[PDB]
């Protein structure tokens, strides 16, 4: 599982044609603020295919 297949799972809005997303900021978390953590209701938007 050499997992160099990172992609994006979550975004605030729909991606427009011919735009690249590079930021690793934490996903939406509308109810509680994540404040820069990967705890409860806090996921990084980068997962691999495996």
């Amino acid at each position, epitope marked *: 599982g050499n997992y160099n297949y990172l992609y994006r*799972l979550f975004r605030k809005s729909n991606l427009k044609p011919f735009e690249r997303d590079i930021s690793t900021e934490i996903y939406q978390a509308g*109810s*509680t603020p994540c404040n820069g953590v990967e*705890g*409860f*209701n806090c*996921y990084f938007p980068l997962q691999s295919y495996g």
Partner: antibody
Amino acid sequence: VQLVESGGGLVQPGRSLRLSCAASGFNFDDYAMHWARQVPGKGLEWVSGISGNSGSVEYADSVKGRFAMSRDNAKNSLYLEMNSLRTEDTALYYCAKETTPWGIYRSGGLDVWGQGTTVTVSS
Amino acid sequence: DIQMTQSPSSLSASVGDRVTITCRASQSIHSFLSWYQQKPGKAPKLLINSASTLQSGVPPWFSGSGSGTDFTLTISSLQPEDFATYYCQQSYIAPWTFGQGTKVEIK
């Protein structure tokens, strides 16, 4: 504010195994003690929780009636008794404090994380 | 919360048949889902976790897939131990609800 876990080990399913973590560097208050489990390579799962003034005990959806918790503030150590052990409960155990025992808006606790002792169950 | 339902509410099959259990969600569940197996008068057990991973001690003929909203579970061959009721629950957000339950009987 250091949390050191202990009590994890290898044991057959169906047997009891009590784990504990001592609270050090924490000023005494009515902080809601919580427990979180992590399957390795998976997400985060909460287990149970006890708030201040005793009582107020709740568990997760699948551990109702099989987990027992009691809080003793004199020893500054919290223990959980494990009953009806299955092969699913193999995970990494983190015990959290959330450090917000406020009278107004007690919810919204920043759950801290300790070193953590995992458990292994082999059938 | 999340209002969930499962279909069918009951099933009837013999030994060796191919049946499927499907249960969807009203909110985006992606992949974090568990399929419990519980017997009458006994404790539950987990067979498939995260909709794609086979648990330790679980036989490999229980195979599942699904992403987004629609979820499914497939049985290659049925066994004498397989005849029981089945639950599927979500594991994403603020506290979850269980399923109404399906049942497989001898036809």
